[PDB]
């Protein structure tokens, strides 16, 4: 028992840290970076210890030695009487999503329209729909797909970004961290939802969390379920009520990476930090809900049940899995052994 030090991508998450951290009795504590690399990085150094991160990202990790500790697992209906902690993570559904006012835009006629990405270099937001367009295009020239974009982590001045808006002053334009106001899982969706896009790659859950008043937020108050809809890959499109015979490609969970000598003890305290602030945590929602953000997937997703043992101690590459590994692997190819730092 030492202290955990979480790294925290933006002000946002350092806010939320830093409750956390004054809650934990200063067991966890709180480092912060401007980027989830530079988080990758203070790990490695060994300045922070832990932080919770999308596929894309695990990947990056791994190569630089860190290991998937524990993965965020979400409701479910298979294995019933079997714990959340203890049961299998059922993975996501990547989806791409549209107004349905948009009518005749298909995945076919996706060209020289206008994207909404969660970030570059993450799993639904980018390594799989970018995959598939260089593989069904046979050409890596993926920066020039769409006519504008707002990818963050891209060239600011580059057309990945020309749909970013930024912050609220409009600081920070095509920034990876919660404060591109079009940046994430809700950012993305909000890009589409405010027809700045024409598509937004996000997963199935964000389409609902954000419809017919889940979400009371300004942006998303009169939206409703019926006026979007997927784009499947064989050219149809479907309602929302759909993803499971519309999707691109099913995601393993958001995952929390440590490096491989710290892993054991991370593992430890936040077993304990959820048995505080879980879904059904001593002190949740009395005092601190370690897994609410507002819709805003602070830290963590907003509709995790708890943070789940993976078991059979995954190395990186078997966590992510063996196709999905092989797909960044081919996308990287554009842009095989050796840790990015
Ligand atoms: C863009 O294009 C890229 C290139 O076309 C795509 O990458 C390709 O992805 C394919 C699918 O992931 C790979 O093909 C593999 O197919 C075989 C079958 O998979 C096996 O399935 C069994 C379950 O029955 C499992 O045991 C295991 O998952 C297997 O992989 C593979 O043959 C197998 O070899 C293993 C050896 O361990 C063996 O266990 C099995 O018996 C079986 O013989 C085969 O080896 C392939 O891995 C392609 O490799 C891959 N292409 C390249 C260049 O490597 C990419 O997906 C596309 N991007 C997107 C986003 O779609
Ligand atoms: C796309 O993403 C959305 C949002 O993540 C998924 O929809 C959610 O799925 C949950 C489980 O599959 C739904 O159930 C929740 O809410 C109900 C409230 O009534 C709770 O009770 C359940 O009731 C059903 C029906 O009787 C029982 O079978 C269950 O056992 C359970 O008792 C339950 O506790 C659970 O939290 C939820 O309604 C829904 N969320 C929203 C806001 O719509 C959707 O499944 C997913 N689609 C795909 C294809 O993955
Ligand atoms: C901070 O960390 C430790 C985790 O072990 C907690 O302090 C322990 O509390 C448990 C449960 O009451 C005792 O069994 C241990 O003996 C304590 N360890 C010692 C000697 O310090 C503490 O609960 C944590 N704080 C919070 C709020 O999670
Ligand atoms: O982490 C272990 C996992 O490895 C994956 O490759 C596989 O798809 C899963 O079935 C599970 O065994
Ligand atoms: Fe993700
Ligand atoms: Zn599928
Ligand atoms: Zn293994």
Redesign the pocket.
């Known amino acids: 028992y030492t202290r955990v030090v979480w790294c925290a991508v933006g002000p946002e998450e350092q806010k939320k840290c830093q409750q956390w951290s004054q809650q934990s009795g200063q067991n966890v504590t709180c480092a912060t970076a401007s980027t989830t690399d530079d988080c990758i990085v203070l790990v490695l150094k060994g300045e922070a210890d832990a932080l919770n991160l999308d596929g894309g990202y695990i990947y990056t990790a791994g190569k630089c030695g860190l290991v998937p500790v524990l993965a965020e697992n979400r409701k479910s209906s298979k294995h019933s009487s079997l714990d959340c902690v203890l049961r299998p993570t059922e993975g996501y559904l990547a989806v791409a999503v549209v107004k349905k006012a948009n009518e005749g835009l298909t995945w076919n006629s996706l060209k020289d329209k206008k994207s909404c990405h969660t970030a570059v270099d993450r799993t639904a937001g980018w ?2 729909p970018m ?2 367009i ?2 069904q295009t046979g050409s890596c020239a993926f920066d020039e797909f769409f006519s504008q974009s707002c990818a963050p982590g891209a060239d600011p001045k580059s057309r990945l970004c020309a749909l970013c808006a930024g912050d609220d002053q409009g600081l920070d334009k095509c920034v990876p961290n919660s404060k591109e106001k079009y940046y994430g899982y809700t950012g993305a969706f909000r890009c589409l939802a405010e027809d700045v896009g024409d598509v937004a790659f996000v997963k199935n859950d964000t389409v609902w969390e954000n419809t017919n008043g889940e979400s009371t937020a300004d942006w998303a108050k009169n939206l409703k379920r019926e006026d979007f809809r997927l784009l499947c890959l064989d050219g149809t499109r479907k309602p929302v009520t759909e993803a499971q015979s519309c999707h ?2 099913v995601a393993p969970n958001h995952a929390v990476v440590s490096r491989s000598d710290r892993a054991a003890h991370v593992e430890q305290v936040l077993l304990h930090q959820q048995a505080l602030f879980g879904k059904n945590g001593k002190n949740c929602p009395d005092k601190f809900c370690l897994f609410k953000s507002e819709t805003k997937n602070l830290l963590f997703n907003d509709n995790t049940e708890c943070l789940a043992k993976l078991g059979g101690r995954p190395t990186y590459e078997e966590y992510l899995g ?3 590994v ?2 960044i ?3 990287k190819k554009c842009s095989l052994e050796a840790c990015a730092f």
């Open positions: 390594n799989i995959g598939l260089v593989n691109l490609a063996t196709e999905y092989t797909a692997a081919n996308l």
